[PDB]
Protein backbone atom coordinates (compact mmCIF):
# COMPACT_ATOMS: atom_id res chain seq x y z
CA UNK A 1 0.00 0.00 0.00
CA UNK A 2 2.98 2.27 0.64
CA UNK A 3 4.14 2.16 -3.01
CA UNK A 4 1.19 1.59 -5.36
CA UNK A 5 0.30 4.13 -8.05
CA UNK A 6 -2.28 4.35 -10.85
CA UNK A 7 -1.46 6.10 -14.12
CA UNK A 8 -4.04 6.57 -16.86
CA UNK A 9 -3.58 6.89 -20.62
CA UNK A 10 -5.55 6.67 -23.86
CA UNK A 11 -8.33 8.34 -21.89
CA UNK A 12 -11.47 9.24 -23.78
CA UNK A 13 -15.14 9.91 -23.13
CA UNK A 14 -18.17 8.82 -25.10
CA UNK A 15 -21.83 9.64 -24.62
CA UNK A 16 -22.86 6.73 -26.85
CA UNK A 17 -22.55 4.34 -23.91
CA UNK A 18 -22.43 7.21 -21.36
CA UNK A 19 -18.99 6.40 -20.01
CA UNK A 20 -15.32 7.34 -19.98
CA UNK A 21 -12.90 4.57 -20.90
CA UNK A 22 -9.13 4.46 -20.60
CA UNK A 23 -6.20 2.08 -20.25
CA UNK A 24 -4.37 2.27 -16.94
CA UNK A 25 -1.20 0.84 -15.47
CA UNK A 26 -0.45 0.32 -11.79
CA UNK A 27 3.09 0.16 -10.44
CA UNK A 28 3.91 -2.44 -7.78
CA UNK A 29 7.73 -2.54 -7.64
CA UNK A 30 7.94 -5.49 -5.27
CA UNK A 31 4.40 -6.66 -4.57
CA UNK A 32 2.03 -9.01 -6.36
CA UNK A 33 -0.55 -7.94 -8.91
CA UNK A 34 -2.72 -5.28 -7.30
CA UNK A 35 -6.26 -6.56 -6.56
CA UNK A 36 -8.98 -5.27 -8.87
CA UNK A 37 -10.89 -3.96 -5.86
CA UNK A 38 -7.86 -1.88 -4.90
CA UNK A 39 -7.68 -0.45 -8.42
CA UNK A 40 -11.42 0.20 -8.19
CA UNK A 41 -11.35 2.34 -5.06
CA UNK A 42 -8.05 4.03 -5.94
CA UNK A 43 -9.41 5.03 -9.35
CA UNK A 44 -12.64 6.15 -7.67
CA UNK A 45 -10.57 8.48 -5.49
CA UNK A 46 -8.68 9.54 -8.62
CA UNK A 47 -11.82 10.57 -10.53
CA UNK A 48 -13.96 11.65 -7.53
CA UNK A 49 -16.50 8.84 -7.92
CA UNK A 50 -17.60 5.86 -5.87
CA UNK A 51 -16.10 2.34 -6.10
CA UNK A 52 -19.38 0.84 -7.30
CA UNK A 53 -19.48 2.32 -10.82
CA UNK A 54 -15.79 1.64 -11.55
CA UNK A 55 -15.19 -1.23 -13.98
CA UNK A 56 -11.73 -2.69 -14.58
CA UNK A 57 -10.51 -5.88 -16.26
CA UNK A 58 -7.75 -7.34 -18.42
CA UNK A 59 -4.84 -6.81 -16.02
CA UNK A 60 -1.69 -8.36 -17.50
CA UNK A 61 1.61 -7.92 -15.66
CA UNK A 62 4.81 -7.14 -17.52
CA UNK A 63 7.66 -9.62 -17.15
CA UNK A 64 9.64 -9.12 -13.96
CA UNK A 65 6.98 -7.45 -11.83
CA UNK A 66 6.45 -3.75 -11.41
CA UNK A 67 4.06 -2.55 -14.10
CA UNK A 68 0.74 -4.19 -14.82
CA UNK A 69 -1.72 -2.84 -17.37
CA UNK A 70 -5.49 -3.18 -17.63
CA UNK A 71 -8.46 -1.43 -19.18
CA UNK A 72 -10.54 0.88 -16.98
CA UNK A 73 -14.17 1.86 -17.46
CA UNK A 74 -16.14 4.49 -15.51
CA UNK A 75 -19.81 5.32 -15.98
CA UNK A 76 -21.88 8.37 -15.12
CA UNK A 77 -24.53 6.36 -13.26
CA UNK A 78 -25.00 2.87 -11.87
CA UNK A 79 -28.26 2.42 -13.78
CA UNK A 80 -26.40 3.01 -17.05
CA UNK A 81 -23.65 0.68 -15.82
CA UNK A 82 -26.28 -2.03 -15.31
CA UNK A 83 -27.83 -1.19 -18.68
CA UNK A 84 -24.74 -1.47 -20.92
CA UNK A 85 -21.94 -3.61 -19.45
CA UNK A 86 -21.25 -7.35 -19.86
CA UNK A 87 -23.17 -9.68 -17.58
CA UNK A 88 -20.03 -11.47 -16.44
CA UNK A 89 -18.57 -8.23 -15.10
CA UNK A 90 -21.90 -7.48 -13.45
CA UNK A 91 -21.72 -10.92 -11.83
CA UNK A 92 -18.11 -10.23 -10.81
CA UNK A 93 -19.40 -7.20 -8.93
CA UNK A 94 -22.32 -9.32 -7.70
CA UNK A 95 -25.02 -7.34 -9.52
CA UNK A 96 -25.99 -10.29 -11.76
CA UNK A 97 -26.78 -13.92 -10.97
CA UNK A 98 -26.17 -16.93 -13.22
CA UNK A 99 -28.10 -19.48 -11.13
CA UNK A 100 -29.13 -21.67 -14.05
CA UNK A 101 -28.70 -25.22 -15.32
CA UNK A 102 -26.00 -26.70 -17.53
CA UNK A 103 -25.98 -26.19 -21.29
CA UNK A 104 -26.14 -29.96 -21.76
CA UNK A 105 -29.23 -30.29 -19.56
CA UNK A 106 -30.83 -27.30 -21.27
CA UNK A 107 -30.32 -28.97 -24.65
CA UNK A 108 -31.74 -32.22 -23.25
CA UNK A 109 -34.89 -30.41 -22.12
CA UNK A 110 -35.19 -28.57 -25.44
CA UNK A 111 -34.98 -31.82 -27.39
CA UNK A 112 -37.36 -33.66 -25.06
CA UNK A 113 -39.97 -30.92 -25.44
CA UNK A 114 -39.91 -31.44 -29.22
CA UNK A 115 -41.39 -34.94 -28.86
CA UNK A 116 -44.53 -33.44 -27.29
CA UNK A 117 -46.71 -31.40 -29.64
CA UNK A 118 -49.04 -28.59 -28.68
CA UNK A 119 -50.27 -29.90 -25.33
CA UNK A 120 -49.10 -27.29 -22.84
CA UNK A 121 -49.30 -29.56 -19.78
CA UNK A 122 -47.31 -32.35 -21.44
CA UNK A 123 -44.91 -29.76 -22.89
CA UNK A 124 -44.13 -28.34 -19.45
CA UNK A 125 -44.11 -31.78 -17.81
CA UNK A 126 -41.60 -33.14 -20.32
CA UNK A 127 -38.59 -32.45 -18.11
CA UNK A 128 -40.28 -33.27 -14.80
CA UNK A 129 -39.71 -37.04 -14.89
CA UNK A 130 -36.17 -37.45 -16.36
CA UNK A 131 -34.28 -35.33 -13.84
Amino acid sequence: NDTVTIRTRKFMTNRLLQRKQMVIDVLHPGKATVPKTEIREKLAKMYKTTPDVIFVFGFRTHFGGGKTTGFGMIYDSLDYAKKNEPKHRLARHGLYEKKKTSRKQRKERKNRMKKVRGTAKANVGAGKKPK
Binding site: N14, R15, L16, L17, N84, P86
Partner: protein
Protein backbone atom coordinates in the same frame (compact mmCIF):
# COMPACT_ATOMS: atom_id res chain seq x y z
CA UNK B 1 -23.45 -23.76 -53.01
CA UNK B 2 -27.23 -24.04 -53.18
CA UNK B 3 -27.85 -20.34 -52.57
CA UNK B 4 -26.45 -16.98 -51.52
CA UNK B 5 -23.56 -16.81 -49.08
CA UNK B 6 -24.13 -15.04 -45.77
CA UNK B 7 -20.71 -15.52 -44.16
CA UNK B 8 -17.38 -13.78 -44.67
CA UNK B 9 -14.10 -15.27 -43.50
CA UNK B 10 -11.80 -12.90 -41.63
CA UNK B 11 -8.86 -13.41 -43.98
CA UNK B 12 -11.08 -13.12 -47.08
CA UNK B 13 -12.34 -9.70 -45.98
CA UNK B 14 -11.37 -6.61 -48.00
CA UNK B 15 -7.83 -5.47 -47.28
CA UNK B 16 -8.77 -1.84 -46.64
CA UNK B 17 -10.87 -2.89 -43.64
CA UNK B 18 -7.53 -3.28 -41.82
CA UNK B 19 -8.70 -6.36 -39.92
CA UNK B 20 -6.17 -8.60 -38.21
CA UNK B 21 -5.88 -12.40 -38.15
CA UNK B 22 -6.07 -13.48 -34.50
CA UNK B 23 -9.33 -11.90 -33.29
CA UNK B 24 -11.49 -14.55 -34.90
CA UNK B 25 -12.46 -16.55 -37.94
CA UNK B 26 -15.17 -14.38 -39.47
CA UNK B 27 -15.57 -10.87 -40.85
CA UNK B 28 -18.61 -8.58 -40.53
CA UNK B 29 -20.14 -9.66 -43.89
CA UNK B 30 -21.94 -6.38 -44.58
CA UNK B 31 -25.60 -6.52 -45.52
CA UNK B 32 -26.78 -5.57 -48.98
CA UNK B 33 -27.04 -1.85 -49.56
CA UNK B 34 -26.03 1.17 -51.63
CA UNK B 35 -22.43 -0.03 -52.05
CA UNK B 36 -20.68 -3.26 -52.95
CA UNK B 37 -19.12 -5.12 -50.05
CA UNK B 38 -15.65 -4.82 -51.59
CA UNK B 39 -15.49 -1.02 -51.20
CA UNK B 40 -17.84 -0.48 -48.24
CA UNK B 41 -17.04 0.14 -44.58
CA UNK B 42 -19.55 -1.57 -42.27
CA UNK B 43 -20.58 0.37 -39.18
CA UNK B 44 -19.35 -2.35 -36.82
CA UNK B 45 -15.74 -1.89 -37.86
CA UNK B 46 -16.16 1.86 -38.33
CA UNK B 47 -17.25 2.25 -34.69
CA UNK B 48 -15.05 -0.52 -33.24
CA UNK B 49 -11.77 -0.45 -35.17
CA UNK B 50 -11.64 3.15 -36.43
CA UNK B 51 -13.10 5.21 -33.57
CA UNK B 52 -12.87 2.72 -30.66
CA UNK B 53 -16.25 3.90 -29.37
CA UNK B 54 -17.12 0.22 -28.88
CA UNK B 55 -14.92 -2.72 -27.94
CA UNK B 56 -17.14 -5.58 -29.14
CA UNK B 57 -19.89 -6.33 -31.61
CA UNK B 58 -22.39 -6.41 -28.75
CA UNK B 59 -21.32 -2.92 -27.64
CA UNK B 60 -21.59 -1.50 -31.15
CA UNK B 61 -24.99 -3.20 -31.42
CA UNK B 62 -26.07 -1.38 -28.26
CA UNK B 63 -24.77 1.90 -29.70
CA UNK B 64 -26.69 1.35 -32.94
CA UNK B 65 -29.91 0.27 -31.23
CA UNK B 66 -29.90 3.35 -29.01
CA UNK B 67 -30.42 5.22 -32.33
CA UNK B 68 -27.43 7.57 -32.34
CA UNK B 69 -25.80 6.57 -35.65
CA UNK B 70 -27.19 8.61 -38.55
CA UNK B 71 -26.08 7.82 -42.10
CA UNK B 72 -26.99 10.24 -44.90
CA UNK B 73 -29.34 11.99 -42.49
CA UNK B 74 -31.24 8.79 -41.67
CA UNK B 75 -31.05 6.61 -38.57
CA UNK B 76 -29.74 3.13 -39.39
CA UNK B 77 -29.86 0.34 -36.81
CA UNK B 78 -28.10 -2.23 -39.00
CA UNK B 79 -24.86 -3.31 -37.34
CA UNK B 80 -23.38 -4.32 -40.72
CA UNK B 81 -24.84 -1.55 -42.86
CA UNK B 82 -22.51 -0.84 -45.81
CA UNK B 83 -21.54 2.80 -45.39
CA UNK B 84 -19.58 3.32 -48.59
CA UNK B 85 -17.97 6.31 -50.24
CA UNK B 86 -18.59 9.84 -48.89
CA UNK B 87 -21.72 9.02 -46.91
CA UNK B 88 -22.03 11.35 -43.93
CA UNK B 89 -21.97 9.55 -40.58
CA UNK B 90 -23.64 11.82 -38.03
CA UNK B 91 -23.62 11.32 -34.26
CA UNK B 92 -25.64 14.05 -32.58
CA UNK B 93 -25.23 13.03 -28.93
CA UNK B 94 -21.47 13.61 -29.12
CA UNK B 95 -21.87 16.17 -31.91
CA UNK B 96 -19.38 15.21 -34.63
CA UNK B 97 -19.83 14.36 -38.30
CA UNK B 98 -17.72 12.02 -40.42
CA UNK B 99 -17.26 11.95 -44.19
CA UNK B 100 -16.07 8.56 -45.39
CA UNK B 101 -13.25 9.29 -47.85
CA UNK B 102 -10.33 7.13 -48.95
CA UNK B 103 -6.93 8.23 -47.69
CA UNK B 104 -3.75 8.38 -49.77
CA UNK B 105 -3.25 4.63 -49.24
CA UNK B 106 -6.70 3.64 -50.47
CA UNK B 107 -8.37 3.13 -47.09
CA UNK B 108 -11.39 4.84 -45.54
CA UNK B 109 -9.96 7.47 -43.20
CA UNK B 110 -11.52 9.12 -40.16
CA UNK B 111 -12.40 12.48 -41.72
CA UNK B 112 -14.26 14.96 -39.52
CA UNK B 113 -16.47 17.65 -41.05
CA UNK B 114 -18.52 20.64 -39.99
CA UNK B 115 -22.33 20.26 -39.83
CA UNK B 116 -22.97 22.84 -42.56
CA UNK B 117 -20.70 20.87 -44.89
CA UNK B 118 -22.19 17.56 -43.73
CA UNK B 119 -25.62 18.83 -44.76
CA UNK B 120 -24.75 18.04 -48.41
CA UNK B 121 -23.15 15.17 -50.31
CA UNK B 122 -21.60 14.52 -53.73
CA UNK B 123 -22.80 11.65 -55.92
CA UNK B 124 -21.58 10.21 -59.21
CA UNK B 125 -24.37 9.48 -61.66
CA UNK B 126 -24.16 5.95 -63.02
CA UNK B 127 -27.05 5.83 -65.48
CA UNK B 128 -29.71 8.07 -67.00
CA UNK B 129 -32.83 6.51 -68.49
CA UNK B 130 -36.27 7.76 -69.44
CA UNK B 131 -39.20 5.86 -67.96
CA UNK B 132 -42.95 5.76 -68.37
CA UNK B 133 -44.89 8.94 -69.16
CA UNK B 134 -41.59 10.21 -70.59
CA UNK B 135 -40.05 10.89 -67.18
CA UNK B 136 -36.23 11.14 -67.03
CA UNK B 137 -34.47 9.39 -64.16
CA UNK B 138 -30.98 9.37 -62.67
CA UNK B 139 -29.23 6.54 -60.81
CA UNK B 140 -26.14 7.58 -58.87
CA UNK B 141 -23.09 5.66 -57.65
CA UNK B 142 -25.22 4.73 -54.64
CA UNK B 143 -28.45 2.82 -55.09
CA UNK B 144 -30.18 6.20 -55.07
CA UNK B 145 -32.40 7.08 -58.02
CA UNK B 146 -34.10 10.42 -58.56
CA UNK B 147 -36.53 11.86 -61.08
CA UNK B 148 -36.64 15.07 -63.11
CA UNK B 149 -32.93 15.96 -63.30
CA UNK B 150 -31.31 18.75 -65.25
CA UNK B 151 -31.19 17.65 -68.91
CA UNK B 152 -27.58 18.87 -69.11
CA UNK B 153 -26.51 16.16 -66.64
CA UNK B 154 -24.97 13.27 -68.58
CA UNK B 155 -23.53 9.91 -67.54
CA UNK B 156 -20.67 9.77 -64.94
CA UNK B 157 -20.96 13.39 -63.89
CA UNK B 158 -21.18 14.60 -60.29
CA UNK B 159 -24.30 15.95 -58.58
CA UNK B 160 -24.78 17.79 -55.28
CA UNK B 161 -27.40 15.93 -53.25
CA UNK B 162 -28.37 17.81 -50.11
CA UNK B 163 -29.57 15.55 -47.33
CA UNK B 164 -33.12 15.53 -45.91
CA UNK B 165 -34.48 16.36 -49.38
CA UNK B 166 -32.66 14.14 -51.87
CA UNK B 167 -32.73 16.85 -54.53
CA UNK B 168 -30.02 18.27 -56.79
CA UNK B 169 -28.65 21.75 -56.13
CA UNK B 170 -25.66 21.79 -58.50
CA UNK B 171 -23.58 19.51 -60.68
CA UNK B 172 -20.12 19.12 -62.19
CA UNK B 173 -19.73 17.92 -65.76
CA UNK B 174 -17.11 15.29 -66.52
CA UNK B 175 -14.74 17.56 -68.43
CA UNK B 176 -11.01 17.83 -68.99
CA UNK B 177 -9.42 20.00 -66.33
CA UNK B 178 -11.73 19.09 -63.43
CA UNK B 179 -10.63 17.82 -60.04
CA UNK B 180 -11.29 14.11 -59.53
CA UNK B 181 -10.58 11.22 -57.18
CA UNK B 182 -9.80 7.60 -58.01
CA UNK B 183 -12.31 5.19 -56.48
CA UNK B 184 -10.68 1.87 -57.34
CA UNK B 185 -7.54 0.01 -58.24
CA UNK B 186 -3.91 0.84 -57.57
CA UNK B 187 -4.37 4.62 -57.77
CA UNK B 188 -7.17 4.50 -55.16
CA UNK B 189 -7.30 7.62 -53.02
CA UNK B 190 -5.37 9.98 -55.31
CA UNK B 191 -6.69 13.49 -55.91
CA UNK B 192 -5.92 14.95 -59.30
CA UNK B 193 -7.10 16.89 -62.34
CA UNK B 194 -8.53 15.28 -65.48
CA UNK B 195 -5.86 15.79 -68.13
CA UNK B 196 -6.85 13.34 -70.88
CA UNK B 197 -9.49 10.75 -71.72
CA UNK B 198 -8.81 8.10 -74.35
CA UNK B 199 -11.84 6.02 -75.29
CA UNK B 200 -11.79 2.44 -76.55
CA UNK B 201 -15.09 1.38 -78.17
CA UNK B 202 -16.29 -1.97 -76.92
CA UNK B 203 -13.98 -1.74 -73.91
CA UNK B 204 -13.09 0.48 -70.95
CA UNK B 205 -12.10 4.12 -71.37
CA UNK B 206 -8.79 5.16 -69.81
CA UNK B 207 -8.44 8.57 -68.17
CA UNK B 208 -5.10 10.25 -67.47
CA UNK B 209 -4.91 12.39 -64.33
CA UNK B 210 -2.18 14.67 -62.97
CA UNK B 211 -2.06 15.63 -59.29
CA UNK B 212 -0.83 18.91 -57.80
CA UNK B 213 2.80 17.77 -57.56
CA UNK B 214 2.84 16.79 -61.25
CA UNK B 215 2.70 13.01 -60.85
CA UNK B 216 0.65 11.71 -63.78
CA UNK B 217 -1.19 8.38 -63.61
CA UNK B 218 -4.12 6.73 -65.36
CA UNK B 219 -7.12 4.58 -64.50
CA UNK B 220 -10.31 3.15 -65.94
CA UNK B 221 -13.29 5.46 -66.35
CA UNK B 222 -15.45 3.55 -63.85
CA UNK B 223 -12.95 4.37 -61.07
CA UNK B 224 -13.21 8.17 -61.35
CA UNK B 225 -15.34 10.43 -59.14
CA UNK B 226 -15.34 14.11 -60.11
CA UNK B 227 -15.11 16.10 -56.87
CA UNK B 228 -14.37 19.68 -57.91
CA UNK B 229 -15.16 22.38 -60.45
CA UNK B 230 -11.81 22.61 -62.20
CA UNK B 231 -9.47 22.63 -59.20
CA UNK B 232 -11.36 23.73 -56.07
CA UNK B 233 -12.93 20.63 -54.48
CA UNK B 234 -16.56 20.86 -53.45
CA UNK B 235 -15.79 18.88 -50.28
CA UNK B 236 -13.13 18.96 -47.56
CA UNK B 237 -10.12 16.85 -48.49
CA UNK B 238 -8.40 14.62 -45.91
CA UNK B 239 -4.82 14.92 -44.69
CA UNK B 240 -2.23 14.89 -47.46
CA UNK B 241 -4.74 16.26 -50.01
CA UNK B 242 -4.86 12.83 -51.67
CA UNK B 243 -1.24 13.11 -52.83
CA UNK B 244 0.31 9.65 -52.97
CA UNK B 245 3.91 10.04 -51.83
CA UNK B 246 6.43 7.22 -52.10
CA UNK B 247 8.10 5.33 -49.27
CA UNK B 248 11.31 7.30 -49.84
CA UNK B 249 9.67 10.60 -48.88
CA UNK B 250 7.46 8.90 -46.30
CA UNK B 251 10.37 7.53 -44.27
CA UNK B 252 12.10 10.89 -43.84
CA UNK B 253 8.79 12.48 -42.86
CA UNK B 254 8.52 9.83 -40.14
CA UNK B 255 12.09 10.58 -39.05
CA UNK B 256 11.39 14.32 -38.93
CA UNK B 257 8.22 13.74 -36.90
CA UNK B 258 10.14 11.54 -34.45
CA UNK B 259 12.89 14.15 -34.16
CA UNK B 260 10.32 16.88 -33.49
CA UNK B 261 8.46 14.77 -30.91
CA UNK B 262 11.68 13.70 -29.18
Amino acid sequence: ARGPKKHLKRVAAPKHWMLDKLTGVFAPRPSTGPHKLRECLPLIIFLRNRLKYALTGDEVKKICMQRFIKIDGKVRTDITYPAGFMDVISIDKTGENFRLIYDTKGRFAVHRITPEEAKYKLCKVRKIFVGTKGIPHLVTHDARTIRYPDPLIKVNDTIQIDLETGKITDFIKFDTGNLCMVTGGANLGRIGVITNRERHPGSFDVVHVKDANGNSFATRLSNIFVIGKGNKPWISLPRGKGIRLTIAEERDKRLAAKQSSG
